[PDB]
Amino acid sequence: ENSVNTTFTLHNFTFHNETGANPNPSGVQNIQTYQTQTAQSGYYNFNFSFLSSFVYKESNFMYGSYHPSCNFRLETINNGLWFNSLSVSIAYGPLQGGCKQSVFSGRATCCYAYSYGGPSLCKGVYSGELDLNFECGLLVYVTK
Amino acid sequence: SFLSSFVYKESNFMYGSYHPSCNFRLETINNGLWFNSLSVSIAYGPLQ
Amino acid sequence: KYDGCPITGMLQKNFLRVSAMKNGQLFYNLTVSVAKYPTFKSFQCVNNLTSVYLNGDLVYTSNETTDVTSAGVYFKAGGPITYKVMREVKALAYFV
Ligand SMILES: *[C@@H]1O[C@H](CO)[C@@H](O[C@@H]2O[C@H](CO)[C@@H](O[C@@H]3O[C@H](CO)[C@@H](O)[C@H](O)[C@H]3NC(C)=O)[C@H](O)[C@H]2NC(C)=O)[C@H](O)[C@H]1NC(C)=O
Numbered sequence: 194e195n196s197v198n199t200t201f202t203l204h205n206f207t208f209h210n211e212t213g214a215n216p217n218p219s220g221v222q223n224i225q226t227y228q229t230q231t232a233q234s235g236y237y238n239f240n241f242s243f244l245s246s247f248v249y250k251e252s253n254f255m256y257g258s259y260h261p262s263c264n265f266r267l268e269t270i271n272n273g274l275w276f277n278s279l280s281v282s283i284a285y286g287p288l289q290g291g292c293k294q295s296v297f298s299g300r301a302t303c304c305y306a307y308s309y310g311g312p313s314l315c316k317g318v319y320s321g322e323l324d325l326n327f328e329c330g331l332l333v334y335v336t337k
Numbered sequence: 338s339f340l341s342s343f344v345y346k347e348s349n350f351m352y353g354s355y356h357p358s359c360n361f362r363l364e365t366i367n368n369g370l371w372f373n374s375l376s377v378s379i380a381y382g383p384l385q
Numbered sequence: 386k387y388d389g390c391p392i393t394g395m396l397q398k399n400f401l402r403v404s405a406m407k408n409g410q411l412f413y414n415l416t417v418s419v420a421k422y423p424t425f426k427s428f429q430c431v432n433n434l435t436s437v438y439l440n441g442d443l444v445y446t447s448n449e450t451t452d453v454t455s456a457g458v459y460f461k462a463g464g465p466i467t468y469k470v471m472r473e474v475k476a477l478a479y480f481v
Pocket residue numbers: 210211212213214215216285311312314329
């Protein structure tokens with residue numbers, strides 16, 4: 194039950210790949226979330242149309258996702274869960290050090306790392322290794 | 338300096354690494370280990 | 386009700402207004418009843434996750450991570466109220 198005088202209507206949060214901007218410069222604060230949404234009260238669902246030709250990158254020593262501390266995978270949010278505060282956002286950063294740097298010194302509890310066929314001119318973020326060129330797969334954030 | 342755009346290939350039935358008998362991964366040698374004799378070398382062969 | 390806000394009720398069994406407010410406008414009106422919140426016991430404002438706590442549970446979260454800059458309570462009479470700041474530790478609670 195909500196406060197008073199409510200018809201329980203779930204909100205529909207949508208996403209779409211847009212004509213994005215340039216990949217990021219050298220700073221890990223210099224990656225910009227090119228979407229933002231938030232959860233306030235009641236019910237929600239998340240229309241993810243990002244299974245279309247986007248492979249999932251399995252986590253390992255440096256690159257990939259950092260789904261520890263959030264056991265669910267991104268295509269299983271829509272089942273019955275219980276959160277306390279929720280906000281997801283997409284961001285087009287580098288791939289080898291996106292999540293392993295953007296969880297500790299960053300702004301999310303855990304993040305995922307999808308990939309696609311991207312141009313290999315992407316300035317990665319890490320202490321001392323920020324002078325190379327990497328891939329650019331889209332990485333979603335989730336603040337559980 | 339071979340993390341630059343070089344993916345790691347997970348071991349399976351034929352291709353990939355054969356890291357059994359050496360539990361460490363290549364980016365974790367620099368922590369405190371103890372060997373008895375050690376020699377590494379790179380070689381550009383096939384993959385499968 | 387006296388004249389001021391559009392609620393029009395002078396009794397108990399009415400509701401409350403936990404509402405956030407930016408510089409010019411208002412949003413997030415939720416109206417919890419005086420039921421389930423019988424008596425004002427405590428009121429916190431926590432740094433991380435920027436969440437605010439009328440006694441016990443949540444009433445409002447948002448995105449940012451912003452520290453508290455001020456607080457204040459109006460009341461005519463009653464018990465002498467207590468202000469206190471705190472740090473973060475681990476604890477465990479027996480509850481039946
Ligand atoms: C999902 O969104 C991605 C983010 O926009 C898209 O990736 C973009 O593709 C563009 C076309 O290949 C790239 O533009 C080129 O970028 C290079 C720099 O790497 C420039 O030199 C080129 O001039 C420029 N081409 C132009 C201006 O015509 C974007 O840089 C690139 N964005 C990235 C990698 O972050 C995906 O294509 C898109 N996928 C879809 C729609 O399926």
